[PDB]
RNA sequence: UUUUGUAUAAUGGGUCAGCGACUUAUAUUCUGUAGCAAGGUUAACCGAAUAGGGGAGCCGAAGGGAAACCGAGUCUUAACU
RNA sequence: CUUUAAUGUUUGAUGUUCUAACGUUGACCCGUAAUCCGGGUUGCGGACAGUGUCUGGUGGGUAGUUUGACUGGGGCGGUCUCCUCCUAAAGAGUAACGGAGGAGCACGAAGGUUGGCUAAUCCUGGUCGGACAUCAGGAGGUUAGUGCAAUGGCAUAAGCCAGCUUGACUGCGAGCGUGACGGCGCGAGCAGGUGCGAAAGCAGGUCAUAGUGAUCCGGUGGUUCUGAAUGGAAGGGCCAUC
């Protein structure tokens, strides 16, 4: 198991996060995706964090 | 906390209904601090609920029977 | 390893430390192969074979980080 | 020996045969590949499961240019 | 003497209106990254003890 | 008696007579029966003491929710066809 | 303020010396008529030794215990969960220390959509070029390919290429399949927001079936839900998660 668990924090200022996995060797870049925030009910860009 | 049946309001006293007037009628325990009057039975006498937390549905029954509710 | 002093003494300290680690690794290999030669033996009756000794041998594979990097050869192709 | 292991049975196969009066959303057949295909008023899940899309009798047919077995539901 | 209740089994079951018991689904404590949200979301509400295990719980809770 | 299975060469008993093994509190659930019935019933205790008092309490007539809380509805949910 | 320097200055360490605590299984006297004990003069060690509490190490000297199951007797060897095929007797299911193989992952594109395309192998000709490299046209009709075993499937392609994106969304869910249960799986549709497409529509991960671990105990972030006289807080509870 070379993939490690990472969490996609929400940039909307609220405390909400998804959780996925990422091979930090092949992809050392920082993920960002437009996902849904149930707290705000809007699509906001999520950036990865520990 | 306890629940007061509507039909229990005919067994209390000459009409005033507070916490103490119910503990005299043995309807609630001696350590009860709050109570509620829910729509469960049927009320005929014009009862005056002094301080309690009657529900919306039971409030209409008390007034329709001739009573009045306060805090 | 915070070392107090100058470069000249720390160099000798590092060399002595490396020599000690080499000796300890060699001793560990000796012990590993001896316990392996014991493991490969038979049972010789309705005897124990020592499950505790088996577990203690299996624990003895804690792995070693080779010093690595330590570049000492480079390739300049002929012209 | 070296072998001697298996895997639990998966209990596939047709569940509602021909002529069954089924309810909406009821599973009609579980399968691994696509043995039967989805016809009218039926669907196909990710497992290639065929489920009723509306209640009614099941009908099996071999329509198609490649002679493929289809499952459809009458509105009865 | 009074029947002792199984204190451990009184922290996981509540007696509902008719006489059944309700409990909390398992498999939702940790390792929550693999699990699909559809599977997780179905585990969030409470459930009812099945008829097979009802006889076993009634014995454990004589008073509740 | 124990077993798939015993005339079994599998176990036990020499024979008579006497003794010898599912009991007794408490608590809980279900059935039958009796009394009262949206009510039923007292405990300790008092008592000329199996009567009569004592209603402290316990169960039941309202449930939902983890809880605050709401209440013939309640919880989930931004809200539910 | 900035680098130090000196005497006072509390202490900290270190060593030397002393006696008064302490030791005396050194001598002498008394109780006494007694190599016990006590008391008294003295000598010698002396704040060391020794004892109490706390603490690190050693400790089969001693004590309590554990040391799995299957098994063509036990031990030795082998196995223990999950996936695919046969045994399996044309619904499901079905055992053996029966016959053959795999898993404990991968992917930020290898997912979603909108366009587009169709393989293996052989023949003939053609620079270094050949039995087989790229090119041209004929046969061939999926004998080809799939992220990794086997089976089922795939041309409307599930196989190959490109553009744009994040539905690898949140709350639910009619109704079914499968389990003794814990549980596992499939699912149209409803509400909020989103991507692609002119639109009809498709999208709640990957062609499907392996890629996994209940509870307890804790950790991290949010939430007035509670907060033991009241106002807070601690600790709990709920959601996400390790
Ligand atoms: Mg009372
Ligand atoms: Mg949790
Ligand atoms: Mg026998
Ligand atoms: Mg015979
Ligand atoms: Mg004989
Ligand atoms: Mg005999
Ligand atoms: Mg015998
Ligand atoms: Mg005999
Ligand atoms: Mg009496
Ligand atoms: Mg209730
Ligand atoms: Mg001696
Ligand atoms: Mg011992
Ligand atoms: Mg013991
Ligand atoms: Mg055994
Ligand atoms: Mg054997
Ligand atoms: Mg079969
Ligand atoms: Mg059978
Ligand atoms: Mg793919
Ligand atoms: Mg296409
Ligand atoms: Mg694709
Ligand atoms: Mg696949
Ligand atoms: Mg307080
Ligand atoms: Mg907290």
TrEMBL record, chain B:
Q: Which residues form the Large ribosomal subunit protein uL15/eL18 domain?
A: 11-70
Per UniProt, Mg(2+) 4 binds at 26
Top-level taxon of the source organism: Bacteria
Q: What's this chain's function?
A: Binds to the 23S rRNA.
On subunit structure and binding partners, the annotation says: Part of the 50S ribosomal subunit.
Family note: Belongs to the universal ribosomal protein uL15 family.
- Protein name per its UniProtKB record: Large ribosomal subunit protein uL15
Q: Which residues of the full protein are shown?
A: 74 to 144 of 144
